[PDB]
Amino acid sequence: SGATRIQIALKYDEKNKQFAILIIQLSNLSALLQQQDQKVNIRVAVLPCSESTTCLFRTRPLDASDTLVFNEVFWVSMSYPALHQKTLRVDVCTTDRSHLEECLGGAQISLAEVARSGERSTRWYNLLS
Ligand SMILES: CCCC(=O)OC[C@H](COP(=O)(O)O[C@@H]1[C@H](O)[C@H](O)[C@@H](OP(=O)(O)O)[C@H](OP(=O)(O)O)[C@H]1O)OC(=O)CCC
């Protein structure tokens, strides 16, 4: 069917020493799902997980569609040097009233070349299962 993709923007805010993760959307979600009508969220993790601050985030759940826009932004407190040791992991999970995640695939993103100035990179990432 193809690759399932997610669009993410990233931006460091050195004024406040925080890192923004913007989860924009999925395309070709049909490929990743066998079932129909499931509810889909994204699980974002900033790794390795430093216990000082919060490293695990979750989007709201939405009704699955081949394209699916979330536009959810998460802010993370972190010095730029800290940020540059981190890998970002985003997974596409299906979920039900059980509140159990079924993360069927996702991407990993080395954060060693996030810019410091402020221009936000927006890129597409292939999912892997
Ligand atoms: C209400 C929901 C919106 C939302 O959630 O958004 C989260 C906010 C605001 O994001 P945005 O402003 O919507 O982004 C704009 C559109 O996506 C558009 O695609 C593009 O125009 P084009 O490419 O079609 O021309 C614009 O480019 P310009 O040309 O203006 O530079 C771009 O700026 O960002 C953050 O949260 C920061 C976190 C890192």
Curated annotation (Swiss-Prot):
Expressed in which tissues: Expressed in mammary epithelial cells and breast cancer cell lines. Found in the luminal epithelium surrounding the ducts in the normal breast. In the brain, expressed in somatodendritic compartment of neurons in the cortex and hippocampus and in the cerebellum it is found in the Purkinje cells and some granule cells (at protein level). Detected in brain, heart, colon and kidney. In the kidney, expressed in glomerular podocytes, in some tubules and in the collecting duct.
Record-annotated C2 domain positions: 2-125
Family per record: Belongs to the WWC family. KIBRA subfamily.
Biological function: Regulator of the Hippo signaling pathway, also known as the Salvador-Warts-Hippo (SWH) pathway. Enhances phosphorylation of LATS1 and YAP1 and negatively regulates cell proliferation and organ growth due to a suppression of the transcriptional activity of YAP1, the major effector of the Hippo pathway. Along with NF2 can synergistically induce the phosphorylation of LATS1 and LATS2 and function in the regulation of Hippo signaling pathway. Acts as a transcriptional coactivator of ESR1 which plays an essential role in DYNLL1-mediated ESR1 transactivation.
Domain text: The C2-domain mediates homodimerization. It is a calcium-sensitive lipid-binding domain with preference for PI(3)P.
Subunit structure of this chain's protein: Homodimer. Forms heterodimers with WWC2 and WWC3. Interacts with DDN. Interacts with DYNLL1 and histone H3. The interaction with DYNLL1 is mandatory for the recruitment and transactivation functions of ESR1 or DYNLL1 to the target chromatin and the interaction with histone H3 ensures proper regulatory interaction of WWC1-DYNLL1-ESR1 complexes with target chromatin. Interacts (via WW domains) with DDR1 (via PPxY motif) in a collagen-regulated manner. Interacts with PRKCZ (via the protein kinase domain).
Name of protein: Protein KIBRA
Organism annotation: Homo sapiens
